[PDB]
Short mmCIF file of all heavy atoms in Angstrom, two decimals:
data_model
loop_
_atom_site.label_atom_id
_atom_site.label_comp_id
_atom_site.label_asym_id
_atom_site.label_seq_id
_atom_site.Cartn_x
_atom_site.Cartn_y
_atom_site.Cartn_z
N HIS A 160 80.99 -2.11 6.21
CA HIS A 160 82.17 -2.95 6.11
C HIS A 160 82.11 -4.19 6.98
O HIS A 160 83.01 -5.03 6.90
CB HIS A 160 83.45 -2.16 6.47
CG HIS A 160 83.37 -1.38 7.75
ND1 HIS A 160 82.43 -0.40 7.99
CD2 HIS A 160 84.12 -1.45 8.88
CE1 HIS A 160 82.62 0.11 9.20
NE2 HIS A 160 83.64 -0.52 9.76
N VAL A 161 81.08 -4.35 7.82
CA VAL A 161 81.00 -5.44 8.78
C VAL A 161 79.74 -6.28 8.58
O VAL A 161 79.81 -7.50 8.40
CB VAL A 161 81.09 -4.92 10.23
CG1 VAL A 161 80.88 -6.06 11.21
CG2 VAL A 161 82.42 -4.25 10.48
N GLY A 162 78.58 -5.64 8.61
CA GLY A 162 77.32 -6.37 8.67
C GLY A 162 76.92 -6.65 10.10
O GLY A 162 77.49 -6.11 11.05
N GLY A 163 75.92 -7.51 10.25
CA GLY A 163 75.44 -7.87 11.58
C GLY A 163 73.94 -7.74 11.76
O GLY A 163 73.18 -7.94 10.81
N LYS A 164 73.50 -7.41 12.97
CA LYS A 164 72.08 -7.28 13.29
C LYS A 164 71.77 -5.90 13.85
O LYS A 164 72.66 -5.18 14.31
CB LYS A 164 71.63 -8.34 14.31
CG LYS A 164 72.11 -9.75 14.02
CD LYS A 164 72.22 -10.55 15.31
CE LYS A 164 70.85 -10.88 15.88
NZ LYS A 164 69.98 -11.54 14.86
N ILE A 165 70.49 -5.54 13.80
CA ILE A 165 69.98 -4.27 14.31
C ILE A 165 68.88 -4.60 15.31
O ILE A 165 67.75 -4.89 14.91
CB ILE A 165 69.45 -3.37 13.19
CG1 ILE A 165 70.51 -3.14 12.12
CG2 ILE A 165 68.98 -2.04 13.76
CD1 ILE A 165 71.72 -2.46 12.64
N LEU A 166 69.20 -4.56 16.60
CA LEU A 166 68.19 -4.78 17.64
C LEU A 166 67.42 -3.48 17.81
O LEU A 166 67.71 -2.68 18.71
CB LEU A 166 68.84 -5.24 18.94
CG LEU A 166 69.09 -6.75 19.06
CD1 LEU A 166 70.36 -7.17 18.34
CD2 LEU A 166 69.14 -7.16 20.52
N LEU A 167 66.42 -3.27 16.96
CA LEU A 167 65.67 -2.03 16.91
C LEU A 167 64.51 -2.08 17.90
O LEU A 167 63.74 -3.04 17.91
CB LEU A 167 65.14 -1.77 15.50
CG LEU A 167 64.13 -0.64 15.36
CD1 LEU A 167 64.83 0.70 15.50
CD2 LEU A 167 63.40 -0.73 14.03
N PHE A 168 64.40 -1.04 18.72
CA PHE A 168 63.30 -0.86 19.66
C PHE A 168 62.55 0.39 19.24
O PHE A 168 63.02 1.51 19.47
CB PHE A 168 63.80 -0.73 21.10
CG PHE A 168 64.74 -1.81 21.52
CD1 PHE A 168 66.11 -1.62 21.47
CD2 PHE A 168 64.26 -3.02 21.98
CE1 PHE A 168 66.98 -2.61 21.87
CE2 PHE A 168 65.12 -4.01 22.38
CZ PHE A 168 66.48 -3.81 22.32
N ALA A 169 61.38 0.22 18.64
CA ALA A 169 60.56 1.33 18.20
C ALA A 169 59.25 1.32 18.97
O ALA A 169 58.73 0.26 19.31
CB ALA A 169 60.29 1.29 16.70
N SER A 170 58.72 2.51 19.24
CA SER A 170 57.44 2.64 19.91
C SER A 170 56.32 3.12 19.00
O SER A 170 55.24 2.54 19.03
CB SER A 170 57.54 3.58 21.11
OG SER A 170 58.18 4.79 20.76
N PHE A 171 56.56 4.16 18.20
CA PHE A 171 55.57 4.70 17.28
C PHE A 171 56.17 4.69 15.88
O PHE A 171 57.39 4.56 15.74
CB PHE A 171 55.17 6.13 17.68
CG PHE A 171 54.22 6.20 18.84
CD1 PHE A 171 54.06 7.38 19.54
CD2 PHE A 171 53.46 5.10 19.21
CE1 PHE A 171 53.17 7.46 20.60
CE2 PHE A 171 52.58 5.17 20.27
CZ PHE A 171 52.44 6.35 20.97
N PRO A 172 55.35 4.77 14.83
CA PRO A 172 55.90 4.97 13.49
C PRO A 172 56.60 6.30 13.39
O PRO A 172 56.29 7.25 14.15
CB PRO A 172 54.66 4.92 12.59
CG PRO A 172 53.60 4.30 13.37
CD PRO A 172 53.90 4.50 14.81
N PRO A 173 57.57 6.43 12.49
CA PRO A 173 58.26 7.72 12.32
C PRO A 173 57.32 8.79 11.78
O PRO A 173 56.54 8.55 10.85
CB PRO A 173 59.38 7.40 11.33
CG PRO A 173 58.92 6.20 10.61
CD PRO A 173 58.12 5.40 11.59
N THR A 174 57.40 9.97 12.37
CA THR A 174 56.62 11.12 11.93
C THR A 174 57.44 12.15 11.18
O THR A 174 56.87 12.97 10.46
CB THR A 174 55.94 11.80 13.13
OG1 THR A 174 56.94 12.18 14.09
CG2 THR A 174 54.94 10.87 13.78
N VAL A 175 58.77 12.13 11.34
CA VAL A 175 59.67 13.01 10.61
C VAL A 175 60.80 12.15 10.06
O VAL A 175 60.95 10.98 10.39
CB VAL A 175 60.23 14.15 11.49
CG1 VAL A 175 59.15 15.19 11.76
CG2 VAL A 175 60.78 13.59 12.79
N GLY A 176 61.61 12.77 9.20
CA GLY A 176 62.74 12.08 8.62
C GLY A 176 62.35 11.19 7.45
O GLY A 176 61.22 11.20 6.96
N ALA A 177 63.33 10.41 7.01
CA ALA A 177 63.17 9.55 5.85
C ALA A 177 62.32 8.33 6.20
O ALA A 177 62.06 8.03 7.37
CB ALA A 177 64.53 9.12 5.31
N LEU A 178 61.89 7.62 5.15
CA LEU A 178 61.05 6.42 5.23
C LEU A 178 59.74 6.68 5.97
O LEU A 178 59.22 5.80 6.66
CB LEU A 178 61.80 5.25 5.88
CG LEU A 178 62.93 4.63 5.08
CD1 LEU A 178 63.54 3.46 5.84
CD2 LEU A 178 62.44 4.18 3.72
N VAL A 179 59.18 7.88 5.83
CA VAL A 179 57.90 8.21 6.45
C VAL A 179 56.79 7.81 5.49
O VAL A 179 56.91 7.99 4.27
CB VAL A 179 57.83 9.70 6.84
CG1 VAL A 179 57.97 10.62 5.63
CG2 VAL A 179 56.55 10.00 7.61
N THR A 180 55.75 7.19 6.02
CA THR A 180 54.63 6.70 5.22
C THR A 180 53.33 7.33 5.70
O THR A 180 53.04 7.32 6.90
CB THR A 180 54.53 5.17 5.29
OG1 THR A 180 54.38 4.76 6.66
CG2 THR A 180 55.78 4.52 4.71
N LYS A 181 52.57 7.88 4.77
CA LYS A 181 51.24 8.40 5.03
C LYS A 181 50.22 7.53 4.33
O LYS A 181 50.47 7.02 3.23
CB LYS A 181 51.12 9.87 4.59
CG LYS A 181 51.25 10.11 3.10
CD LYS A 181 51.09 11.59 2.76
CE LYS A 181 52.31 12.38 3.18
NZ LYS A 181 52.23 13.80 2.74
N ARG A 182 49.07 7.32 4.97
CA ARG A 182 48.04 6.43 4.45
C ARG A 182 46.84 7.25 4.01
O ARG A 182 46.29 8.04 4.80
CB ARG A 182 47.64 5.39 5.50
CG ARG A 182 48.75 4.40 5.81
CD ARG A 182 48.21 3.09 6.36
NE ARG A 182 49.14 2.00 6.10
CZ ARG A 182 48.84 0.72 6.22
NH1 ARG A 182 47.64 0.32 6.61
NH2 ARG A 182 49.77 -0.20 5.95
N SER A 183 46.43 7.07 2.76
CA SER A 183 45.30 7.80 2.21
C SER A 183 43.99 7.13 2.60
O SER A 183 43.93 5.95 2.94
CB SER A 183 45.42 7.90 0.69
OG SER A 183 46.68 8.42 0.31
N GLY A 184 42.91 7.92 2.53
CA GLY A 184 41.59 7.43 2.84
C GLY A 184 41.20 7.48 4.30
O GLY A 184 40.05 7.16 4.63
N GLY A 185 42.11 7.87 5.19
CA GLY A 185 41.82 7.90 6.61
C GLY A 185 41.60 6.54 7.23
O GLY A 185 40.75 6.40 8.11
N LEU A 186 42.36 5.53 6.79
CA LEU A 186 42.19 4.18 7.30
C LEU A 186 42.91 3.94 8.62
O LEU A 186 42.76 2.86 9.20
CB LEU A 186 42.68 3.17 6.25
CG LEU A 186 41.81 3.01 5.01
CD1 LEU A 186 42.56 2.29 3.90
CD2 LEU A 186 40.51 2.29 5.34
N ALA A 187 43.70 4.91 9.09
CA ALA A 187 44.37 4.76 10.38
C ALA A 187 43.41 4.84 11.56
O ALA A 187 43.76 4.39 12.66
CB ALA A 187 45.46 5.82 10.53
N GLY A 188 42.22 5.39 11.35
CA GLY A 188 41.20 5.48 12.37
C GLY A 188 40.28 4.28 12.48
O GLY A 188 39.25 4.37 13.15
#
């Protein structure tokens, strides 16, 4: 009902919960 900004401070990618992304092929290494 308002809008605005999200001053998000994240350290690692999410490992649980929604919007979790896994990368195929083992390219994270």
Side-chain angles (χ1 to χ4, degrees):
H160 49 301
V161 175
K164 314 152 71 53
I165 305 299
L166 275 81
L167 170 73
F168 309 97
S170 49
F171 283 162
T174 56
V175 287
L178 290 182
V179 61
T180 58
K181 65 179 73 174
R182 292 204 155 194
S183 307
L186 289 165

